[PDB]
Design a protein around this nucleic acid. Structure first.
Lengths: 221, 221, 221
DNA sequence: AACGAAAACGGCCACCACG
DNA sequence: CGTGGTGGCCGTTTTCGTT
């Protein structure tokens, strides 16, 4: 179980993400999906006794929001070497849906030589909206997304890593494929509300957390 | 954190601009955007213990409002050599959007040899309105602005400098790219109201400041 | 330095308009722009020791407000021959922006044979609003105005004359081109407030003056 | 049975009044 | 001065009548 670094969120998840499965967090923009991704990108490298996976991180960005400085802040919060964190995070920006899936081909071969624990795909659904904008081409983007999700599941079962994808809510296919769906909504200021909206094992429940300069971290009224 | 030279504004920002990120100040004309730019162009050279960055300044002007005498006034206010301030400020007027972006090519190579802390682009959006005035050419100016903003972010991450751009409100793309949005409005006389309209870390809040011959400086009723 | 004929205004300008440069006075209607123009049209002919330029005047009118009788009043105030004043003032009404610029072609050749000291363009911006009223044609009037301003600067540098243009405030291009911007506002009765709103050499400052039958002349409470 | 014309209804725009 | 509501005009659709 990879620690989220929010204790309340860890309790909500019973200790953190299950490696080897896809966890989807759907919420409005600015809810902190990207911030949680940046935090996990570092916490994954933490020792297992500290809630990490003792593995490198993979950040596939489609939205430009990748900040190595956020990774440095998370590393210094938990006392990890920021330089080693950036050395254990491989980053690449996907320009389109086809490029987004093509990066998985390099990811599968690269993930064999080194132990990874986390795969991050940020604005995973944005490129299927910007690229495929027509109505007759909807089935094509749905097929590409389906294949992409199957590839995610395959890599998860192959390397035993956690698969994190982010969705902006301004597909029903992900429900059966994703094991845990988390709904994120803004509480005013920088403090966010998290809700579980389906889990066969986890209750439907809510937990409050905040977005702090160091971290994605528990709410401290 | 580069001191704004207004204490109330510094408190509003928790001490001043974060270097390495873009801070956008949108407000009506005559609200003092240019005055704040002139003040920061000198305060950046202040010692870090005094709220500066101990670096040279870069002023890219598109509106003709550049005044070295204002820089001299700010330098004498804080006791900086006005001649050295003008020697540590490189100035160039952009004639068009293409020239505005082209100046960044000289800026990137020139910013490598000397330490800079502040990049100022005044009336940054005016040239996209004067040059691109048609309606079919809107996407072209939006693309050029997008590339310009990406170049700003790249230079910010490369040199760890503060990126300041000014917008006259007589684009939605800047929101995700800009980290702190400040709304400026006139209070009658020479005293201006500043409001924070988005920050993931800073509260939505307001602070009152004035525009004084020496300085951009706190309101003194 | 051509005397304004208001002593307080002369002090505000450090003695009067610099010949060879454009001085813009922007203010509300009825603030006295036209009255100041009529006064200067005569004072320019005054001896240099009296604050004149010892040159003829040029009045390009676009608004119908040209009054030779006002010129006669200014001439008799300072003791100048009203008939010779009208003989040293060449007048022409511009019917459109194209005609307004076309008159400059006759002005350049005519200004070579005789010494002039003042060029007056009254409601200089009105024809760009009445002629070019659409929104798609804004760039065309802006280009025509830009060329007109460049022609003004060229004539100023060629003949060393003062260039006076009047703007009704019910363009940002003029700022870099105009050397001294004066804001005019009404004080009730016939007494007007003048403010300097940009000058690299002149302070931002204000001076009170009145509009008297003889003259544009100092306020006398 | 098909086409054309007339009438009615709905939506959009402009003007006036009130806050 | 700005926003909201009401009224009027225009356009489109449907129905009826005539060829």
């Amino acid at each position: 179980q990879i620690t989220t670094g929010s204790k309340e969120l860890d309790k909500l998840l019973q200790g953190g993400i299950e490696t080897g499965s896809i966890t989807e967090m759907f919420g409005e923009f600015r809810t902190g999906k990207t911030q949680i991704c940046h935090t996990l990108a570092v916490t994954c490298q933490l020792p297992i006794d500290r809630g990490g996976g003792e593995g490198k991180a993979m950040y596939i960005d489609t939205e430009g929001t990748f900040r190595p400085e956020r990774l440095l802040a998370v590393a210094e919060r938990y006392g990890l070497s920021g330089s080693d964190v950036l050395d254990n995070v491989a980053y690449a920006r996907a320009f389109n849906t086809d490029h987004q899936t093509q990066l998985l081909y390099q990811a599968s071969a690269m993930m064999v030589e080194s132990r990874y624990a986390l795969l991050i795909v940020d604005s995973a659904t944005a490129l299927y909206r910007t690229d495929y904008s027509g109505r007759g081409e909807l089935s094509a983007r749905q097929m590409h997304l389906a294949r992409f999700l199957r590839m995610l599941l395959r890599l998860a079962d192959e390397f035993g890593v956690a698969v994190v994808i982010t969705n902006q809510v301004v597909g029903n296919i992900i429900a059966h494929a994703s094991t845990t769906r988390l709904y994120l909504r803004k509480g005013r200021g920088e403090t966010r509300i998290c809700k579980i909206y389906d889990s066969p094992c986890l209750p439907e429940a809510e937990a409050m957390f905040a977005i702090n300069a160091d971290g994605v971290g528990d709410a401290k009224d």
